[PDB]
């Protein structure tokens, strides 16, 4: 664990008070909203409904882009981490109601609001998880950059490559932000912690500057992992050593197709995906694909090969629609 520099700490400021604008689905406008301004209202709200907030932190790529700017991985991905308790169902209608009552707050038109109305406008995606480990609330926002105010309880320590394991503490920097006369400058600032969620923070910071691709949890690897994987590929990203990552990548392949048997449930989740990461790339759209195909055509297992030129050709006639339209 190691402790922010004034230049990542500076950096971490301007993505918090960075105007980020919501698309309205409807007749409703855009929000002018801000991750400051939604930490403050939702804690708040939070605190007030009886729910404890022992920590506010910082995920995605927007936590990489702090510790390492224009580290390749893009700053479209603004995750907000609340670890609050979730005992009852009715906890997690408290988390509802807090961001629904949130999303009034950053509205002067005509127009009917209701708590219902401004989800079916503003909320794109919710997941309701309570499971043995697993325990958790999310609630994203439109992207046309994207919001994600995710709820953890308790995780089951998802995996994730060590370039986008971080996780940046806000809580002294919302601390300051409620309790200060002056602006945050160099002279004086909160010291803020950044972690990773993969081990050792050096050693993934390494991995950021370098741009290496490693993990130290295979095991814990699904379906998502070959996306993922191809997703740092596209962006430059190389293994820390080609030898092992041959047996990663068939390993992805094979937890890919166990997950995503049906070939109509994998095109509903790659065109989901392809809208996602690359919305107006489309070179990069063709060149996720191609990686894709790659990884596919050369590291699905010889018994997998009937699944194999059938995704290959998904994958194939996926490019050529994005390569036409």
Sequence with gaps: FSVLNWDQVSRLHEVLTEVVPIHGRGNFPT???????????????????????????????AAGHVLVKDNGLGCKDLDLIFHVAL??????????????????????????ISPVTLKEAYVQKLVK???????????????????????VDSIRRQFEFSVDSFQIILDSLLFFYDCSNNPISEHFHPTVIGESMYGDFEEAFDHLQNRLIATK????????????????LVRDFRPTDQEEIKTLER???????????????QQRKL????????????????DYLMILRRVV????????????????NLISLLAL?????
């Design 217 to 232: 949890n295979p095991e814990e690897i699904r379906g998502g992992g070959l996306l993922k994987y191809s997703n740092l």
């Design 87 to 112: 005992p009852t169902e009715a906890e997690f209608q408290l988390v509802r109601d807090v961001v629904l009552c949130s999303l009034l707050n950053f509205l002067v038109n005509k127009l009917k």
């Design 271 to 286: 065109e989901t995906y392809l809208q996602n990461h690359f919305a107006e790339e489309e070179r990069s759209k063709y």
């Design 321 to 325: 629609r994005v390569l036409a339209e």
């Design 31 to 61: 929000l002018e909203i801000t991750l400051k301004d939604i930490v403050q209202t939702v804690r708040s709200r939070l605190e007030e409904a009886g729910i404890k907030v022992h920590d506010v932190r910082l995920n995605g790529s």
């Design 251 to 265: 390993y992805m392949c094979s937890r890919f197709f166990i997950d995503f048997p049906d070939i109509l449930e």
């Design 129 to 151: 998880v309570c499971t043995d480990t697993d325990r958790w609330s999310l609630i994203s926002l439109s992207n046309k950059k994207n919001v994600e105010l995710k709820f």
């Design 297 to 312: 055509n050369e590291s699905t297992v010889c018994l997998m090969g009937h699944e194999r030129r059938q995704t290959l």
